[PDB]
Amino acid sequence: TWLPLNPIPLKDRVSMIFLQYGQIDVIDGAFVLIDKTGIRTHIPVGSVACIMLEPGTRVSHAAVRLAAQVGTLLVWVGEAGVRVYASGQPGGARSDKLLYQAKLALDEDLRLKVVRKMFELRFGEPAPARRSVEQLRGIEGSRVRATYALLAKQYGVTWNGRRYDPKDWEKGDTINQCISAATSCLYGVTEAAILAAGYAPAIGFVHTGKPLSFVYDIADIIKFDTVVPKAFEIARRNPGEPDREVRLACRDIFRSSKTLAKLIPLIEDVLAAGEIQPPA
């Protein structure tokens, strides 16, 4: 007859898969990539947290529907692999979770508590007492400049700042290209995680007002432990196509660091600092 199709836990999944140049269809209820020559490739879409769609892909209505049904995030990436768009289940969010997050964000004191927790998790020490959100922003930014400088010195990479040109990908450094791609991967799995946990990516605490604010918040906590160093290591080699090497490196990092298994507890831990009783 017929049986319902439900998402499996995020931690139980491969982190991401990259697809390019072919049409994505559904055949007998399965996700399938077909290239220009007719070669059919089957994608275990339910076993992945993120499917990254590169230029030249053409996705059927049925495929987008299927990805949403199994809870796999579709991410469209452009040049230098930057995230450009995403697709997922709109009715995926949980009201108690959403309202919990909203309550924490709307209250400046609770918001401050959550920001302080983010700071402590990110830097391994408490933030100086009685500092506003903006002051914490400044401290965080300063420490980040220091981290970029240090990584550059360790991997022996020339660093002239975080710079990219929105109108031309060739205008940026190789290192910045790498950082952009790596960060892109991290934001992919992070957005997937935030959505799976039932929260809204747009409601953030350090970063606010953007459609991916909370994603920025969460990713920033662990981005310099994991992906950015690997970006400097790859940039050091000056590769031809540094994107694919960065994407593979990030996959390996996510597996060895068990990032998917860690992201949802990280989110819950961060929000719990508001000291309002959590849902569930």
């Binding site: 007859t1 049986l3 199709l5 439900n6 499996i8 836990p9 139980d12 559904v26 055949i27 007998d28 209820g29 399965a30 996700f31 089957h42 275990p44 879409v45 339910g46 076993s47 199994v70």
Partner: protein, 78 residues
């Protein structure tokens, strides 16, 4: 999380695709994946619910002596 193999015989196309949602089809009716116990059980109720006339064997990795266990749906000589 342990290795999983599903071998199907004479099952309708919808089960063939359904398994392709989580597992990799390396041969006709031969699917491979790495899943947890509860996902393995979910896949099994998919099988029992869709195999219809066909028959299926599902084998997975364990810490038992032989290193694996397996269960079947429908009939088969083996």
């Amino acid at each position: 999380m342990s290795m999983l193999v599903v071998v199907t015989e004479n099952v309708p196309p919808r089960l063939r695709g359904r398994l392709a949602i989580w597992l990799l089809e390396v041969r006709a009716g031969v699917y491979v994946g790495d899943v947890s116990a509860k996902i393995r059980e979910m896949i099994w109720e998919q099988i029992a619910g869709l195999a219809e006339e066909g028959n299926v064997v599902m084998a997975w990795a364990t810490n038992t002596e032989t290193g694996f266990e397996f269960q079947t749906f429908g009939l088969n000589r083996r």
